[PDB]
Each structure stands twice: as structure tokens, then as C-alpha cells.
């Protein structure tokens, strides 16, 4: 009856509840298609990586997906449907769950740096009916590159093939650059890996 048995209930619960986790997550660790990077794809550069972490801190994900679904209309609107290999070095993944603003999986080189700067500084200013927050502080802030070294080391440890060359002087790739510089660098790499392999 297991309802007078406190540990027996506990055990069968921890058992019952585990099956789906073991059957869905575990085999993906070992699946090739979701761990292979796309053809020529490199890890994010010091600056890109620093900007990706800026994208993360600002909550951009909360309005922007990075995951193009394999429908014709999504394809037409954004480009090639996203591929498992593209996000293989994304700790943590930034596929969306909402599109308050458009998908950014392939903002690629679709817009100029200059546009990106204007638009982040005040989206309403270039896209009058935008609901995006203004991000002017990105311009007033300067990366010092203190932690870039650590971040790459951490990520290499997690599988991302950063070179010793990469870690050495990841600091001076970044030092003095503005947060906005980094955000733009990041945005300009999104989805480029697939379309130039």
C-alpha cells in the first residue's frame, strides 16, 4: 500500500520522478548531432564573449529568441533555420522562449554597426514604434578586461576550444572597449558561422 511506509514512498517517488530525466537528458550527452560544432565555427572572441555576457546581464533574452524554426515563413523572415551545431559552445544557451522583438539568431551582418549603436542607444529613435528599452549606459561603460581571461579558462574547461593564444591577451582585446562595442561585436557574429562555412 506504500502510504504507511515513509521511506518506501520516498524511494518510489525518487524512482518514478527520475525516469524522464534519465531518458531525455542522458542520451543527448552522447548524441553526435547536438555536440558537433557547425563546420568552421570558432568559439566567441574575447570581445564577443564579453558582449554575450552583456546581452545576458541586460535580459535581452526576455524579448529576443535565437532559434529559427524550420518553417518556410521563419526561413523567409530570418534565414536558415537554426542548427544544433550553432549553439554547441553556448554556456548557457540563449534560444528564446519569447519574441517581444524579432529573432536574433541571424542578425548576422544584416545591419551596420552604426545602426546597432543608434538603435541600442534609443530604439524608438530609429524604430519609432519599438517597445525595446533604451540601453544608453552601454556607451558610458568601458570594459577593463579583468575577467575575460578567467571566463575563457572556465569555458575551455567546459569544452570550448580556446587557444592559449586566445586566453593570453584576451584582456587587451577587450580593455578600453565600451560595453556597446562589445554588445555590437556579439550581435554581429550571431548566425554568421553557418552561412559562411
Amino acid at each position: 500500500k506504500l502510504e504507511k511506509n515513509v521511506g518506501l514512498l520516498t524511494l518510489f517517488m525518487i524512482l518514478a520522478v527520475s525516469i524522464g530525466g534519465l531518458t531525455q537528458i542522458v542520451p543527448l550527452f552522447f548524441q553526435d548531432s547536438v555536440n558537433e560544432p557547425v563546420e568552421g565555427m570558432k568559439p566567441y572572441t574575447a570581445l564577443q564573449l564579453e558582449g554575450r555576457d552583456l546581452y545576458i546581464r541586460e535580459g535581452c533574452v526576455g524579448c529576443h529568441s535565437q532559434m529559427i524554426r524550420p518553417f518556410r515563413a521563419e526561413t523567409e523572415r530570418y534565414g536558415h533555420y537554426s542548427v544544433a551545431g550553432e549553439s554547441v559552445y553556448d554556456h548557457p544557451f540563449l534560444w528564446g522562449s519569447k519574441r517581444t522583438g524579432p529573432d536574433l539568431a541571424r542578425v548576422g551582418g544584416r545591419y551596420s554597426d552604426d545602426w546597432h549603436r543608434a538603435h541600442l542607444y534609443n530604439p524608438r529613435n530609429v524604430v519609432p514604434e519599438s517597445k525595446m528599452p533604451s540601453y544608453p549606459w552601454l556607451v558610458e561603460n568601458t570594459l577593463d578586461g579583468k575577467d575575460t581571461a578567467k571566463k575563457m579558462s572556465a569555458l575551455r574547461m567546459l569544452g570550448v576550444p580556446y587557444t592559449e593564444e586566445d586566453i593570453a591577451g584576451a584582456r587587451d582585446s577587450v580593455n578600453g572597449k565600451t560595453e556597446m562595442d562589445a554588445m555590437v561585436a556579439y550581435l554581429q557574429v550571431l548566425g554568421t558561422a553557418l552561412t559562411n562555412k
Binding site: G20, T23, Q31, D114, V126
Partner: protein, 303 residues
């Protein structure tokens, strides 16, 4: 997927399904036909509970979902490496294969249309109302965010609706702009020309070339401006300010087509620090077909 993980999944999946069927039938044992009543032994605070049966419909709904689960897992990928048995899809269904088909079918439908316009010259497409409607629709999707939804631009971004073209406004020029992109390079004259130098050409360009009036008491040396302009500016912008479409040097004898403002101060900034307009190339994002239509659309705008 290796064949181990393939089975690993199928077994645990079907094992859970078998488990659930067992659960559902096991507890449905000495079932009391209908709503019955009576209680059971032992209470909790006050809460007690009826030994009532599982509702007939709810039972069936449970079996419905489980049966369908099998039906679907047979038809579709899910049970490990088990490519689907779904008819119509060769080698089994994947989200990729479904997309391949979807686009492929679109090409059989919308192909002839694109083909039809691709055979015509840009200007021929432009006088075809249908094509322009399509150009307009393409434009709204891929261009409106920079060049405005009205195509009339904003600061930094050319108005494509007017009669002023920086890179030329013949079809071929317009197509090239869109197809290959365009980067302009107005170099910076600040250091080269001096701050007073900047102030003077700016005033010269504003008053004498563009025919705009100068703000009150701004003592600029227009003669200097004139000379500075002839010495340096004229090479790209033509002396007289007729512009040079080869370089994307815009005409300066009219503020009409200027994308960086026309105030003395703004001119000063353009002149002092340069400009580098970029029109991103669409050859890669949109392909020759879409681009052709877009060129026709933009061409149409000005007539």
C-alpha cells in the same frame, strides 16, 4: 545516436507506457460500478475520503491518450532511432525533411512568378503593378527598418522615395546598391583643415552651395570656405557641388538629399569627423530574385 542509446530510449519510454497501463488497470480493481459513497478508515484532521471509482470517461480519456501515444510513436520519430512509419515521407519524417518539402513546394508554385520577373529588365518590372506590390511587400520586410516604412528615410538613412540618389538612380545603379551593398567614405577634415577651416567650408556649403541661410552673426569666412571647398571637397563633390555618383559623394548644392542634417553644426560634424554610410549587401540574405524585385520597387517609387 548509437544503437545502445536508441534502445535505451525506446525501452524506458515503452516501459513507462506499459507501467502506466498497469497503474491504470491495477488501481481500477474492485471498482464500485458508480458513485457509491461510504468512506474509508482513518481521518486526517477532519478530512476523510470516499472509496469512489475512477470516472468512466476519465479512464477512457487516459486510455485514449496512451493509445494515441503509441500510434504517434509508431508514425513518428521518438522511440530512439525509430525513423517514422508515416506515409508520404521517404525514409521517415524529420522536421528538416518537412521544411525541405515545404520550400520545394513553394518553389514549384512561386517559382514561375519569380522566373517571369527575372526575365524582364528592372525598369520593365517597375511598370508592372503586380511586381511593384511584391516589391513593396519585400521592402516592408527587409528594408523598412533602416529606410523607414514609407521608404522616406531618417537621419543617417537615405530617402529612397525622392529624386535624389547618392549612388545614381538608374536601375542598374539601384540594383547594385542593393545587390552588392555600398559603403561611403567622407574622410575627416578636422585635423587636415583646422577647426576654423571646418567652420568655413561648412558655412560655404550651407550658404553658397546649398542656399540655406546662416544663423545670425556667425562670422565665417565664406571666401575661405570657398577656397577650402575648391581645394579639397570639390574633388569628390564637384566644385559647384553637383556630387559624384561614382563615389556616392552626394550633391551639396541642395540640402534636399542630405542624410546627416543640414544645420551648420551638423555640417561641421560631418566635415570635421567624416561619414561612413553602410548599405548592407542583400545578395546573401535575399538572393538575386528578391533583390531584382526590390530594385524594381525602389525604382518605381520615384515616378
Amino acid at each position: 545516436m548509437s544503437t545502445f542509446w536508441s534502445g535505451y530510449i525506446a525501452l524506458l519510454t515503452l516501459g513507462t507506457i506499459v507501467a502506466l497501463f498497469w497503474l491504470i488497470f491495477a488501481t481500477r480493481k474492485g471498482e464500485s460500478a458508480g458513485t457509491t459513497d461510504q468512506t474509508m478508515g482513518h481521518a486526517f484532521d477532519g478530512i476523510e475520503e470516499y472509496d469512489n471509482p475512477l470516472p468512466r470517461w476519465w479512464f477512457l480519456l487516459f486510455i485514449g491518450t496512451l493509445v494515441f501515444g503509441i500510434l504517434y510513436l509508431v508514425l513518428y520519430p521518438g522511440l530512439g532511432n525509430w525513423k517514422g512509419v508515416l506515409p508520404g515521407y521517404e525514409g521517415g519524417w524529420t522536421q528538416e525533411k518537412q521544411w525541405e518539402r515545404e520550400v520545394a513546394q513553394a518553389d514549384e508554385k512561386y517559382g514561375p512568378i519569380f522566373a517571369k520577373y527575372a526575365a524582364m529588365s528592372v525598369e520593365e518590372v517597375a511598370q508592372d503593378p503586380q511586381a511593384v506590390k511584391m516589391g513593396a511587400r519585400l521592402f516592408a520586410n527587409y528594408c523598412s527598418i533602416c529606410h523607414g516604412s514609407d521608404a522616406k528615410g531618417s537621419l543617417g538613412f537615405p530617402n529612397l522615395a525622392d529624386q535624389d540618389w547618392r549612388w545614381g538612380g538608374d536601375a542598374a545603379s539601384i540594383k547594385t546598391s542593393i545587390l552588392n551593398g555600398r559603403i561611403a567614405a567622407m574622410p575627416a577634415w578636422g585635423q587636415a583643415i583646422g577647426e576654423e577651416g571646418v567652420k568655413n567650408v561648412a558655412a560655404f556649403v550651407r550658404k553658397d552651395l546649398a542656399g540655406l541661410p546662416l544663423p545670425e552673426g556667425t562670422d565665417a569666412d565664406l571666401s575661405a570656405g570657398k577656397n577650402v571647398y575648391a581645394q579639397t571637397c570639390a574633388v569628390c563633390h564637384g566644385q559647384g557641388g553637383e556630387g559624384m555618383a561614382a563615389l556616392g559623394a552626394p550633391k551639396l548644392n541642395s540640402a534636399a538629399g542630405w542624410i546627416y542634417g543640414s544645420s551648420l553644426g551638423q555640417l561641421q560634424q560631418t566635415i570635421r569627423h567624416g561619414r561612413n554610410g553602410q548599405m548592407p549587401a542583400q545578395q546573401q540574405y535575399l538572393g538575386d530574385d528578391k533583390v531584382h524585385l526590390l530594385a524594381a520597387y525602389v525604382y518605381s517609387l520615384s515616378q
